[PDB]
Amino acid sequence: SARVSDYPLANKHPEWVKTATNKTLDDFTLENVLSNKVTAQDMRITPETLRLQASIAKDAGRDRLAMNFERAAELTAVPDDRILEIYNALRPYRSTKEELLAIADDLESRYQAKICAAFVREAATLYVERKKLKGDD
Amino acid sequence: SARVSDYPLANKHPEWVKTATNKTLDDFTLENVLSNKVTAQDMRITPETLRLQASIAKDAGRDRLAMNFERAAELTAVPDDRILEIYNALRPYRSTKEELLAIADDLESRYQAKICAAFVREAATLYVERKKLKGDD
Amino acid sequence: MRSKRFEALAKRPVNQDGFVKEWIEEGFIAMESPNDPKPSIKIVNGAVTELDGKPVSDFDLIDHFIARYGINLNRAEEVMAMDSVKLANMLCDPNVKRSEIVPLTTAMTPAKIVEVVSHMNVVEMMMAMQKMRARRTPSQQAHVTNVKDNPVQIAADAAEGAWRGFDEQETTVAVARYAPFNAIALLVGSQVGRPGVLTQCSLEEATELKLGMLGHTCYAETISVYGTEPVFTDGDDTPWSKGFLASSYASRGLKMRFTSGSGSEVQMGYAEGKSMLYLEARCIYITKAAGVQGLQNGSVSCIGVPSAVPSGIRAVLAENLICSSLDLECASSNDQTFTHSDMRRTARLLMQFLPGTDFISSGYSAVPNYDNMFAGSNEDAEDFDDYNVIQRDLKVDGGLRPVREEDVIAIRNKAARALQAVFAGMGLPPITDEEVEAATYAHGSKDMPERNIVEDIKFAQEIINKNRNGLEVVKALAQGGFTDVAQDMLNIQKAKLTGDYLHTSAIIVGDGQVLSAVNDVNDYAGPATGYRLQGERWEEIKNIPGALDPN
Amino acid sequence: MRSKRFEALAKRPVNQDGFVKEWIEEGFIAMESPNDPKPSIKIVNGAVTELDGKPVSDFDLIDHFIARYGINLNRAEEVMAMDSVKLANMLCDPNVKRSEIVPLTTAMTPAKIVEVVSHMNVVEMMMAMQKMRARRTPSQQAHVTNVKDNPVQIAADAAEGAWRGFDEQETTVAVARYAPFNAIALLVGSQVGRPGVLTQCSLEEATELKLGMLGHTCYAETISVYGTEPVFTDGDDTPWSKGFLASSYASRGLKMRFTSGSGSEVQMGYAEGKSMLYLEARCIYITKAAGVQGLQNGSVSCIGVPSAVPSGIRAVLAENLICSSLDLECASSNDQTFTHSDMRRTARLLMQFLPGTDFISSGYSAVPNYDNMFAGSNEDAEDFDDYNVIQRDLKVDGGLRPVREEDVIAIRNKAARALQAVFAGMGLPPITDEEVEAATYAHGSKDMPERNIVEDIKFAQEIINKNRNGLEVVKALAQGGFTDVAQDMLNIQKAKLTGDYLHTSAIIVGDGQVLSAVNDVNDYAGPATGYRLQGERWEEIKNIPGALDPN
Amino acid sequence: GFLTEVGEARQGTQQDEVIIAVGPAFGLAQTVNIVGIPHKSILREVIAGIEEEGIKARVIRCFKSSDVAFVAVEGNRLSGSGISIGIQSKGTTVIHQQGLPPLSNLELFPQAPLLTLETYRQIGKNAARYAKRESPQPVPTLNDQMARPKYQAKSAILHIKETKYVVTGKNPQELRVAL
Amino acid sequence: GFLTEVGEARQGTQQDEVIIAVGPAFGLAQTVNIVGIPHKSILREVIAGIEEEGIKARVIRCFKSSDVAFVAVEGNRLSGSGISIGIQSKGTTVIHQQGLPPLSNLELFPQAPLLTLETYRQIGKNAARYAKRESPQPVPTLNDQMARPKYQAKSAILHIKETKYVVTGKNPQELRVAL
C-alpha cells in the first residue's frame, strides 16, 4: 500500500481516509456535527487507516513503529472499557495465568486480534517466570 | 641552526644561552645578585638567542614570528632610551620624513640594524602617502 | 578568622544546591561506572541468547523486551564488532549522514551505545545532536498549571503559551479529581492561542487514557517506563503493559510518547549497582522496542539526582543523544528545577538549546514557578525575555518569539471568554465575568479570585462518570459564538482520523499541516546545510522589545 | 489595564541591557553585512596588487601592511578559488587535521576567512575551536585591581588568583602614577600564589614598555591594534609603530600579544560602513603580519557594541575562531561586563569555555566587580563557586580549581608580608601590620584601611624617575627573609633571557616548565583524542565544597 | 520504641475507623522525616486530627513495598471505611481509598519538606471526613520550586534507606503507639 | 546657545590660566551629556572650580580630532600653565598637561554616566591646583560595573555623532561663554 511518498495522507490522498458509512474528511463540518448527522462514532480512526500508516512507517525504515500501528489496527475493534480491562490485567499482580490466557483467547476468537493475543500470551508466560501475577507480591 | 626538537632551549640547550655581557644562566643566583657579581646590565637577551628562536619558529611553520624575532635580534644593540625615542617618532604626526630617514640611517650604521632600517624606511614613504607626518593633522 | 571572601561566596545560591559524592553501589554515578556491563550479543537460531554479558537464563522482563523487540538482529553482530571510538567519530562527523548511522545504532545493544557516546565531550554531543535529531525543525513544549487547579487561569496561560510559540502544552493537577477541568481548559485555551497546538493532561495511566477516550486530550507523554524491574513494578507496569497501552492510544488515533529520565531508579530505590545513563539506555530501548515513536528524557523529574554528581549534566545530554541516535523523537527535559543558581541552570539548558532537539524543553513553565505543579521548571514565564535575547545573540532558533502585551492580553481574554461559554453549555459551575478579567491580566494564581473547589470537583468527576465526551465542548462553543474554536477543535479530530501525526516527531503547524520527521527530514551535512535560522523567522527573532533605533 | 505578567517581565534585569537595531552605514552590524567586501586577491610579480576588491592604488596603511606581511602569497590564489562552504566544513570536520588547514587559512584574505566562518553556527564554531586552538591545554587569565590602587590588597588578590589556577594576571591603575606599585605588588603576589604566573600592567604604550624595560612586568597584552586607519590614528599608532613596538618587547626578552576586539571602530567613531567582524579580521591579520604570536580578542572592552545587535555574541565567537585558525594564541575575552542578567552572561562565556581556548577568558575578575578597574568583568570573585560547579557538571576543564579557605588565607597572608618586606627594603611608604591583616581577610577595598596616596604616588614615580629595577625587588625579598619568593622572582626574570616563552601560547607551568604551542601541540582528531579532562585534574575539579557523602 | 507489632492487621472492624499505613522504617531505622520532624509528633498529630472528627484510627505497618501508594493501598483494603493514609519515613503522605487505582488517590502531599505538624493534623481530619463520607475541602496545595533542588538527592538516599526493610510476601502488622 | 567663536586660540602668556577644551559639537549639535546634564551647567561648574582657586579659565573648541585625549592635548599646548581639561559632548573628561604623551594624563574620568555637577566642579578645582604646581588628591575614583552594559552602545552612538564635526587641519577656536 502506502509509502513515505504518500505521506501526509491528509495532503496526498485524503480519499484513502474514509468511514464505514463512507463519509470523508470533507463532511467533518461543525454543521453536520451540530445537525447530529456526524457523530462521535463516525470520528473514530479505522483499522484500514492504521494499516496505511503502518506501511508508511515500514517504508521509512521504522519497523517497530509499524508493528505498533498493526496491533493498534487490531485494537480498534475492542471496546473502550474492555481496553481498560486488558491493560489493568497486564499490570503487576492483577491477574493469574488463566485470566491472561483467557484474555488472549477472547482477543483471538472474538476480536480476531491475532498479534495482540500472541502479545498477551507471551506476557502470560513471562509473568510466570518473573513473578508478576496475582499473589506474587 | 635550531628546530622544534631543540625547543625549549633551557631544557635542551641551556649552554647555548648567554647574556649580552657573556653571562650564563647559572650565573644568575641569589648570592651573585646580592654580591653584585651579576647586575641588571647582565640580564639582557642576546641577538644569538633571538635568532635561535627565529629558526625554531620557522621550523614550526611560523615565518612571521621568525621575522619579528629577527627584527628584535637587531634591536638588542639599540639602547632603551633610543628604542623609546624610535617608537614615538613612528607615531602619527610625530616626525618629518627626513627625521624618519635619519633614524633609518642611524639604525643602519650605528647599530647595523638593516632589517629595521628598511622597516622605518618603508613607514616613511607610506606615512608620506598616507599622510601621518608632522603637520598632517 | 573567617575570610570575608568566603563569607560572600557562602551566601551564593549555588551553595544551597544538593551535591553528592559518587555512590557507586546505590547507582549514584551519572555515567561511566566501573560496574556497568560491557557490550556483548550472542544470537542463536534468530533469538538473542546473550545481552551485554547477561545470559537469557538471567534476563529480566526488560531484557526480554529489548532482546525480542528492541535490537535489529540482522546487523547486531556486525555492529558490535565495530570500534566504539570510530562510531563516536561518525556520530559527530558532519559528513557521515544520519541515514548511514541509524542502521548501525538500531543494531547496537544498550551497553554498546552507552560506550559510544561516553567517548564524547559536550561539544561533540552537540555537534552529533544537530545531525541525529529526527525532525529538521526544532520545537518547544510548555507546562500550563496553577496551584489551585483554576480552570480559568489555565485556559488563559495556555493561550499566551500557544501564542509565544509552544507547539505542545501540558497540564496536571494539584487535586486529581480536577483533571477533566484542567484538560478542557488546556485544550480550549491552546486552540484559541494557536490552532494545532497539542495538549496533554498528565495523570495515572488508566485515568489518563480514559480522558483521551473521552476526547479532552490530543496526545499523552508521561507514559512511564523505568530501567530496573523493581522500579517498573512500583511504577505499576511492565514492558508488556506499557507496550499494550501504547498500541491502545494508537487504536484511538492518539499520538503519544514514553517518558523516562536518568536518576528515576536511584530515586525510586533500586538501581542495581548501575550508572544512571546505562539504566536510562535500557529505557530508551524499551521505547524503541514497544514501537513508540518518541521519548521524553534528559532526566526529567529526577534532575536533582544526576545534577548532584559529577558529569551528571553531560550524562543528560548523552541520554538525549542516544534517544535521537536510535531514531526516536526527543522531548528533551529542561522542564524541572535542579538549582538555585541562574548560571548553572543556563548551562544545563544550552546543551539542547544550541544544537536544537525535537522539543528543546519538554515543559518550559508558561507560568511563574510558584504556579508550576511539576514543582517548577528550569525556565519559567519570568525568563521569557532572556530566552528571546539569547536567541538573537547566537542566531539559534529556540522555538519562541517576542510578543506584544496588547496581543497577549487579547488572546488571554478570548481564551477566558471561550472557556466561560463552555462551562455554560455543559452546565458547569459558573465562570464569572470578574474571573474572566482577572485571568486576562494575571501573572499567576495570586491574581485570581478564589473558587469553590468542592463544587468544581463534583462536576469534574461528572464528566468522567457520565462519559461526557469532547463533542459536548464543541457544541458548547458554537452556542457561545466560538464557532472558530469549535471548528479548530473539530480540525484536531480530523487529524486524529488521518493518523499522520502518529509518526516520529509530529506536530501540527500552521493550518493543519503536520510536520513530522517523515516530511521534515533532518538532512544535516555541516556548515550551510540542515536547519538554518534565516528568512522571516530570523527577523521575528531579532525584533525584541527595547531594540532602539540608533537615530 | 496592566498585564501583571508583563509588569513582572519589565522588572527583569535583562531589560536594563542596551539593545540596538542594526545600523549598517555606521557599521552597527556584527557580521554578514551587505557592505562588506567580497574576497579577491591579485598577485603580480610576488606583490599583492588587489586585496578583497581594493586596488593597491587605494590601499590604506592597514591594507599595505596586510598585503606585504600578513598573507601567504604562495597559496593565496589557490585557496581563494576553493569553496568557502567546503573550507567551513573542513574547519569543524574532526578528521581534517589542524596542520592541513593552517596552510590554507594563512593564504586567505581577511574577507575570505570571514566568508568561511559565517556559514557556521555556534555549535560548528565550537567544534572548529577545540581543534584550531593553538595550545593543547586550555588556560585562564585574571584581573587583579582595586579602586584605591591599594598595593597590599593587589598582592593579596594576586596570590589567591594564582592559587585558584590563573596562569596570567593583569593589573591596571585608577591613578596612572601608582602604576609601578601595582606592577610590583602584582608580580610579588602572583609568585607567592604560584611561581610562573605571568603578570602585566596595562598602560599607555611608552609607559608600559618602560615599566617592562625596568623588569617590573613579565609580559604585555593590551598592545592595541585597530581595524580602520582613522581609529588607529586616534589610538596614536600605525601598524609600523605597533610592529616596531612588538619587536622592541621581544628584544627585551618579554612576551607580548596584541589586543583587538569587535566594535572598537564603531565605538571610536569610524567603522567605514563595515561589519564589526570584517574590521576585526583586519586586526587579526595586522597581528599576524607584524609577527606577533597571539591576540586578545572577542570584543574585549567594547562588548557592548556587538551585544547590542543580532548575532553579536556569535560574531564574538567567530572572531576568536579566525584568530586561532590563523595560528595565533587566542586570549578570548570573557573579561568585560555587557549585561545585567546572569543567564545572558553565562551563555556568552560558554562559547569559549566549552571548546577551550588558549585563555578561556583574558580577565576573569579576581576581585569583586566593584573593585574592577576595567569597569567590570563578565565573571568576578563571587562567581568562583559557580564556575567550579559547571566544570564538574559538564566535565569541562575551565582552567580553575576549587580551593579551601584555610589555604587562601595563608597564601594571602604570605603575599602581604612579602610585599611588607619589599616596601621596607626599598624605603617606600610602609605597609603596616594592620594592613597585612586586613589584606588577608578582605574581599575587596571596602575592607581595607586607607593609605596616604599622595605619598604613595610620590615614591611610585621615583621608581620610574630613578630607574629602580626588579633586582631591587629581589634584593629586598631576600633581606626580609623571603628568600623563596626571591628565588622565584629571580627564576621568572631568568625566563626573559632564554626566549622560550616568546612562542605561541607560552605559559610557564609547574617547575619552571614552559608550555607553549611548540611543545603542547593541539592534536585533536575527534572523540577520545586531543585534550580530555581526566586524571588528577578531573579529581580536583570533582571535589567542590558541599559534596556530601551519602552517609 | 513507640510502636510495637501486635500482629497481622485484619479487615473492617466497622465503618468508623481510618487506617494509617506506615512504611517499614518509620519509627525504626528512621525516626524523623526529611527535615527533622520526628515520627511520634507526626503520628500523634494525625491520630489527633482523625479522632477529633469522632473517627477511630488504626495504625499499620506495611512491608510489601516502600512506595507510599502501595503502602496506602495495603492499608485501604484492610479498612472499615475504605480510606487510608500512607506515610513514608521521609514524610511523603497520601490519602487513598479502595476502588482507586494504586497510583491514583484522594489527596497527595508530594513535597515532604513542606509538611508541618499543623498540616499532618489536617490530613488526619480530612481522612476521617472522607471516611464519614462528607466532602472535605482539600488540604491546601503546598508547592516550593526549590524543594527538589534542596531535597531530591536527600530524598533519594532516604528512600533507598527505607526500601532495604521491604519484605516480599509480608502482610501488614498492627501497631500500638507510645504517645 | 552660548558659546561664541572669537577666533583662533593663541598660546597663553601668563600661567594663571587653565584651558578647557571641548569637542567639535560640544554645546552645538549636542546640548547635554550622556545622562542629560546640560553642557551649559557642566562648563559653568568646571569654570567655577577653577575660578575658586584663583586661576583663570580659558575655553576653546577643538576640531582636529574628537578623541578626548587629542582634544585636551590641543589645549595643553595653548595653555599658559600647560594644564588643560578635555571634554567630549557625552561628558567624558580628562585633565591633561604639556609634555605628557597624548594617551597619558593627570586625571581621567572614563565613565561619564557617573559624573555629577559636583564632580565637574571638583575637576575644575583639581586642574587649578595642578596649574599652581600643587599635588591635590586625585578626585575619588567613580567605577560602576553596569555603566558599560547600560551606556556603551549609547556612548558609541553619541561619539559617532560628534565625530561628524571633525575638521582636519583646523586649529582650535577661542570661545566666549554665556553662563
Ligand code: B12
Ligand atoms: C519526582 C516526581 C516523580 C518521580 C519520582 C516518584 C517516586 N515515587 O520516586 C517519577 C517521575 C518517577 C514520578 C512518577 C510518578 N508520578 Co510524579 N512527581 C514528581 C514531582 C515532579 C516532584 C516531587 C518532588 O521531587 N518533591 C520534593 C521531594 C523532596 O519530596 P518527596 O515528598 O520526597 O517527593 C516524593 C513524592 O513526590 C513521590 N511521588 C512522586 N510522584 C508521586 C505520585 C504519586 C501518585 C504518589 C502517591 C507519590 C509520588 O516521589 C517523590 C520522591 O520520593 C511531582 C510534582 C509536585 N507537584 O511535587 C510529581 C507528581 C507528584 N507525580 C505525579 C504523577 C501522576 C506520578 C505518576 C503516577 C505518573 C505515571 N505516569 O505513572 C508516577 C507514580 C509512580 C510512583 N510509584 O510514584 C503527580 C500526582 C498527581 C496527583 N496524584 O494528584 C504530580 C503531582 C505531578 C506530575 N504529574 O508529575 N514522579
Ligand code: B12
Ligand atoms: C571602553 C574602554 C576602551 C575602549 C574605547 C576607547 C575609546 N576612546 O572609545 C578601547 C579598548 C578601544 C580603549 C583603548 C584605550 N584605553 Co580604555 N578603557 C575602556 C574601559 C574598559 C571602559 C570605559 C567605559 O566603557 N565607560 C563607559 C562609557 C559609557 O563611558 P564613556 O565616558 O563614554 O567612556 C569612554 C572613556 O572611557 C573613553 N576612554 C576609554 N579608554 C580611555 C583611555 C584614555 C587614556 C582616555 C583619554 C579615554 C578613554 O572611551 C570610552 C568610550 O568612549 C575603561 C575602564 C574604566 N575604568 O572605565 C578603560 C580605560 C579607561 N582605558 C585605559 C587605557 C590605558 C586605554 C589605552 C590608552 C590603551 C592602549 N593600549 O593604548 C587606549 C587609549 C585609546 C584612545 N584613544 O582612547 C585606562 C586609562 C588609564 C588612565 N589614563 O588613567 C582604563 C581606565 C583602564 C584600562 N587599563 O583598560 N579603552
Ligand SMILES: [K+]
Ligand atoms: K513534559
Ligand SMILES: [K+]
Ligand atoms: K586581559
